[PDB]
Amino acid sequence: ETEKLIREKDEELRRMQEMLHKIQKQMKEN
Amino acid sequence: ETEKLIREKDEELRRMQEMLHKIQKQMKEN
Structure with missing residues (x-):
């Protein structure tokens, strides 16, 4: 259970x- | 700054x- x-x-x-x-990739496309 | x-x-x-x-390794070790 704990594992x-x-x-x-x-x-x-x-x-x-x-x-x-995904945010970093979209910021680079922006 | 945001990047x-x-x-x-x-x-x-x-x-x-x-x-x-590290916790996983220590649990396996016991």
């Missing part, structure tokens, strides 16, 4: 970085 | 992942 919870938190942090990268 | 701010947030997210990986 899965920590993996979920790592996934959340990756998704947050994916969003920031 | 630097977004890079700073990405660095923060990577440091949070580094911390989770």
Whole structure:
């Protein structure tokens, strides 16, 4: 259970970085 | 300034992942 919870938190942090990268790409296109 | 701010947030997210990986390693070790 705890191991899965920590993996979920790592996934959340990756998704947050994916969003920031998409903003960076759109700012470069702008 | 905003470009630097977004890079700073990405660095923060990577440091949070580094911390989770250290916890994962220590849990596996016991």
